[PDB]
Structure formats: structure tokens, C-alpha cells
């Protein structure tokens, strides 16, 4: 139970690490072991079949070739078919939405000086606090209110999310989703590294790690309690900052000078006996509302879903904890108040699924695509270390840098 190279984390970053490493002739003859505390690879990529009828994305769901060329290239590399992602339009702009577009354009020259303060305080410079609250609310992302989200970061959030990208004049970017779910890409990469000799040990959580001569000694625990020790010569931790902080490896202090934050996310998918929303011409439309649903998506004639973050992600999760009955009834109420129709005219769902991610988004509050432990030479890999914080593209960028660093260590 040992290896030459070990990767902890079978998300898109770790699987892509193993892919680069196994493509290099420098790794010929070296064993490679991949761990993940979950029984299936993918991480924050989780595709599911809603009532066995349609494919849905409980995790990452959309991408843009203009923003994410490495992801586009990976979809092609593994012959994954893409489809148009329709939730990019915002023609029915409200007064507050048009006001924010104008305010952000008018305030942009002030980013050099005040770009580091919270987005809320930055927008408050336009017409006051109250006006800023109403403007920011109309974007549907509650993270924009948080004091740890600076003005610069918020311009990045607005300009990069398909529903609100027109607010910073990024209409040109196209958006696509996986025809069969991004899980097909995960499996394509897993099958690729497995065929190249990589061995997978799924269902094992890394608890601690120590230096052991020229290598490392890992302590893992299976999901059923089975304790396990693994010795390796090279170690990549393809896990996000929230997980790094639990391994007692002095993260982030001994890995970088930046600080890192995270945000919870919540998605709920509902399907019905009939596409009742067609009576309102809402198919392929997204509604942003000052309502706990926040963002409401109607996928053609198949289903609907909502997507929330920060305070509202916790709202729906706490609501879920009180029981599924009250949860579905709350959705019914908020759908009526959001669409302006009598609650009794909103039918009950035929089937539904929801997912809560305590750390759905992890972001840097300020450089290298991958990190090196000051004290041991372990490598850290995550989208949080790149210019694409919170996106799969960032995971691909980090994996490339992490594998380059390791091959450098190998040739040392």
C-alpha cells in the first residue's frame, strides 16, 4: 500500500492532474494512486437524472468557450456533446437593473482607487446605500452584498455569469451545457487515467499527512471506518481551501500569502406532470426576483429549478431541515408571489431533488495557479488559486500548473 505519486481529490482538478502526469514520459514506470472521500469521482460536478426522465446538474451546469477555452477543449478531447445554454438573456430589464448597469459603467473609473472595498459600499457611491441595495438585489446573487466581496470581484462575478453578463456588456459570450451532464466528462477522464495505470481508492478521507524521509505518510479513513496508511513519494492535494484548512498543514499561511473564502450554494429541481409554465411563455427563461427563490429557471418543457447562494442558500437548507412537506409548500408560495398568480393555480410537483454545497464557491481575496508547501514540497491544486476562482476552467488551469510543478520535482 504505497505509490510513487498520490493525488487526493477526484474532482476535475485531480483527475486532470493524473491525466497530465500520465501523459509525461517522465512518469513511465511510476505508480499513481488517487484518493477521494466520496464513492464517486466528480466533486462539485454532480449530474443526476430527475425522475429518470431528464439530466440535471446539481453542481456545475454551464460553461462558455469565450471564457473557458480549456474546458471547451476538454469536452472535445473526450467527445462530449454540448448544447446551447438558454439562460443568458435579460431583455425585460427593470428600473433598478438598468440603473446598476449605468452605475457600474459610471463608477468603473473609480475602481483603481476604491476597487478593494466591498461592492455594496462601492455602489453606494452612486446614489446612496438604499439605492445600492435595490440595484444589487436585482442581480440574483446574494454574494454581491457580502463585505468580503470587493468591487473588483463583483465586476468579475457580474460579467462572468450568463444571467447578468449583459450588465457589463458581455453579451457576446456564448454559453453551453453538457447534453448528457458533465459527469460524462468526469468519467471520460477517469477512464483515461485508469487505462494508463492509475489506481483509484474511492471512499477514503485523508485525515493527516507527515513527511517520511523523502516521501510522505498519509492517514486515511474509509467511509465505513476502516483505517488506512499510505506511503507516497510525491503528493498533490487536489482539494479546495476549505478542505486544506482541516488537514493541520498550516494552510494557507505556509502555502501562500493570500486569504481564501467560501460561499454556500443551493439548487432545487422540480418536475411536474405538465409544463404548466408554458401558459406564461416562460420556457427557456430565467426570472430574477426579490424573493427567496432569487433565480427561477424554466428549462424548455422539461422542468424548472432555482439557484441561490450565501444567505438564501442557507435559507433553503434550513427550510429543508424542517421537513420536505414545508419545503415544497414554501416553493409553492414563493412561486406564486414571484409569478403574480394565485397559489392554488401552481400545481404540486411530480418529483424533485435538491443539493446544498456548504462550500459551493471558494475564492481568493486577492496568484500562482498552483501552490507549493513552504515546509514539505506538497503541491495544492484548486480553482481557488487561479484567475477563474469558482469555475471549472480554474481547476483545469491549476491542474496544469500542479502537474508541471510535480514533474519539475521529479526531474530535480
Ligand X SMILES: Cc1cc2c(cc1C)N(C[C@H](O)[C@H](O)[C@H](O)COP(=O)(O)OP(=O)(O)OC[C@H]1O[C@@H](n3cnc4c(N)ncnc43)[C@H](O)[C@@H]1O)c1[nH]c(=O)[nH]c(=O)c1N2
Ligand Y SMILES: C=C(Cc1c[nH]c2ccccc12)C(=O)O
Please indicate if the annotation marks 104 as binding a ligand: no
Grid cell 510525491 — which residue? 234
Binding mask 245-274 for ligand Y (x = CB under 6 A): ------------------x-----------
Binding mask of the shown chain, residues 318 to 337, with x at each position contacting ligand X by CB under 6 A:
--------------------
Which among 163-171, 221-229, 249-257, 340-348 is the span making contact with its own copies, rule CB under 8 A? 221-229
* DSSP label of 43: T
With CB under 5 to 8 Å by kind, the binding choice for 128 among ligand X, its own copies, ligand Y, none is: none
* Shortest distance in whole angstroms from residue 157 CB to ligand Y: 5
Residue 114 burial (CB count, 10 A): 15
* Residue tagged 526531474 (cell numbers): 411
Range 344-383, binding ligand Y (CB under 6 A): 361
Task: Write the secondary structure of 184-241 as one string of H (helix), E (strand) and C (coil).
Answer: HHHHHHHHHHHHCCCEEEECEEEEEEEEECCEEEEEEEECCCCEEEEEEEEEEECCCH
Q: How far is CA 161 from the centre of its chain?
A: 12
In this structure, are strands 2-8 and 227-237 parallel, antiparallel, or unpaired?
parallel
**In angstroms, what is the minimal distance from the CB of 161 to ligand Y?**
6
Q: Is 70 annotated as a binding residue?
A: no
Residue 110 annotated as part of some ligand binding site: no
- Determine if residue 307 is labeled as part of a ligand binding site: yes
CA distance 209 to 263: 27
Question: Which residue stretch of 13-21, 41-49, 198-206, 392-400 sits at the interface with its own copies (rule: CB under 8 A)?
Answer: 198-206
C-alpha cell at 155: 465586476
Q: Cis link prior to 252 (omega < 30° from 0)?
A: yes
The residue from 63, 175, 277, 356 that contacts its own copies (CB under 8 A) is: 356
β pairing state of 176-178 and 227-237: unpaired
Is 161 labelled as part of a ligand binding site?
yes
Question: How many residues of this chain interact with ligand X, rule: CB under 6 A?
Answer: 37
Q: How far is CA 55 from CA 30, 49, 66, 124, 299, in A?
A: 38, 4, 25, 41, 11
135 is in an annotated binding site: no
With binding defined as CB under 6 A, does residue 141 bind ligand Y?
A: yes
User: Which stretch, 60-68, 119-127, 288-296, 327-335, contacts ligand X (CB under 6 A)?
Assistant: 60-68
Q: 506511503: which residue's cell?
A: 231
Site string for ligand X, 217-256 (x = CB under 6 A): ---------------------xxx--x-------------
Question: Contact region for its own copies (CB under 8 A) — 248-256, 295-303, 355-363, 388-396?
Answer: 355-363
Please check if 392 is assigned to a binding site: yes
For residue 330, the minimal CB distance to its own copies (Å) is 15
Q: Of all residues in this chain, which one has the CB nearest to ligand Y in the complex?
A: 390
CB nearer to its own copies: pick between 70 and 359: 359
For ligand X, which is the closer residue by CB, 45 or 193? 45
- Residues numbered 230 to 249 that lie near its own copies (CB under 8 A) are none
What's the CA gap between 70 and 293, in Å, rounded? 32
Cα separation, 381 vs 397, whole angstroms: 9
DSSP secondary structure of 350-400: SEEEEEEEEEEEEEE----SEEE-TTT--EEE-GGGSTTTTSHHHHHHHHH
Measure Cα distances from 350 to 55, 112, 271, 301, 343 in Å.
Answer: 16, 51, 6, 14, 17
141 binds, among ligand Y, its own copies, ligand X, none (CB under 5 to 8 A by kind): ligand Y
Coil/strand/helix, residue 76: helix
- The closest alpha carbon to 149, from 362, 365, 294, belongs to 365
- Residues of each annotated binding site: 11, 13-14, 36, 44, 62, 161, 206, 238, 307, 392
The footprint of its own copies (CB under 8 A) covers 1, 199, 201, 204, 222, 224-226, 228, 317-318, 321-323, 355-359
- Residues of each annotated binding site for FAD: 13, 36, 44, 62, 206, 392
The footprint of ligand Y (CB under 6 A) covers 141, 143, 157, 161, 263, 309, 361, 390-391
The footprint of ligand X (CB under 6 A) covers 8-14, 35-38, 43-45, 59-63, 205-206, 238-240, 243, 265, 267, 357, 360, 382-383, 390-395
Amino acid at each position: 500500500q504505497s505509490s510513487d505519486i498520490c493525488i487526493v481529490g477526484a474532482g476535475i482538478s485531480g483527475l486532470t492532474c493524473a491525466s497530465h502526469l500520465l501523459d509525461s514520459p517522465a512518469c513511465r514506470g511510476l505508480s499513481l494512486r488517487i484518493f477521494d472521500m466520496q464513492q464517486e469521482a466528480g466533486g462539485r460536478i454532480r449530474s443526476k437524472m430527475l425522475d429518470g426522465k431528464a439530466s440535471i446538474e446539481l453542481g456545475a451546469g454551464r460553461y462558455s468557450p469565450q471564457l473557458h477555452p480549456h474546458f471547451q477543449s476538454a469536452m472535445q478531447h473526450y467527445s462530449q456533446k454540448s448544447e446551447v445554454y438558454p439562460f443568458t438573456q435579460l431583455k425585460f430589464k427593470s428600473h433598478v437593473q438598468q440603473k446598476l448597469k449605468r452605475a457600474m459603467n459610471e463608477l468603473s473609473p473609480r475602481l483603481k482607487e476604491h476597487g478593494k472595498e466591498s461592492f455594496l459600499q462601492f455602489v453606494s457611491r452612486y446614489q446612496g446605500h438604499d439605492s445600492a441595495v435595490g440595484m444589487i438585489r436585482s442581480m440574483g446573487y446574494d454574494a454581491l452584498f457580502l463585505p468580503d466581496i470587493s468591487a473588483e470581484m463583483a465586476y468579475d462575478i457580474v460579467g462572468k455569469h450568463p444571467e447578468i453578463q449583459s450588465v457589463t456588456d458581455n453579451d457576446a459570450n456564448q454559453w453551453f451545457a453538457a447534453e448528457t451532464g458533465f459527469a460524462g466528462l468526469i468519467q471520460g477522464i477517469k477512464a483515461k487515467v485508469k487505462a494508463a495505470g492509475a489506481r483509484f481508492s474511492l471512499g477514503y478521507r485523508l485525515l493527516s499527512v507527515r513527511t517520511d524521509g523523502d516521501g510522505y505518510l498519509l492517514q486515511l479513513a474509509g467511509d465505513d471506518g476502516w483505517k488506512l496508511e499510505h506511503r507516497t513519494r510525491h503528493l498533490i492535494l487536489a482539494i479546495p481551501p476549505s478542505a486544506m484548512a482541516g488537514l493541520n498543514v498550516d494552510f494557507p499561511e505556509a502555502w501562500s500569502g493570500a486569504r481564501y473564502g467560501s460561499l454556500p450554494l443551493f439548487k432545487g429541481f422540480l418536475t411536474y406532470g405538465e409544463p404548466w409554465w408554458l401558459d406564461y411563455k416562460l420556457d427557456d427563461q430565467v426570472l430574477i426576483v426579490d424573493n427567496p427563490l432569487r433565480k427561477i429557471y424554466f428549462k424548455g418543457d422539461k422542468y424548472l429549478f432555482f439557484y441561490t447562494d450565501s444567505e438564501m442558500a442557507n435559507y433553503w437548507r434550513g427550510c429543508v431541515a424542517e421537513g420536505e412537506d414545508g419545503y415544497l409548500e414554501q416553493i409553492r408560495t414563493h412561486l406564486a408571489s414571484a409569478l403574480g398568480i394565485v397559489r392554488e393555480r401552481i400545481p404540486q410537483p411530480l418529483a424533485h431533488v435538491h443539493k446544498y454545497w456548504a462550500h459551493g464557491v471558494e475564492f481568493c481575496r486577492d496568484h500562482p495557479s498552483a501552490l507549493s508547501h513552504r515546509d514539505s514540497g506538497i503541491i495544492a491544486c484548486s480553482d481557488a488559486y487561479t484567475e477563474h476562482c469558482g469555475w471549472m476552467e480554474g481547476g483545469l488551469l491549476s491542474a496544469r500548473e500542479a502537474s508541471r510543478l510535480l514533474l519539475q520535482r521529479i526531474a530535480a
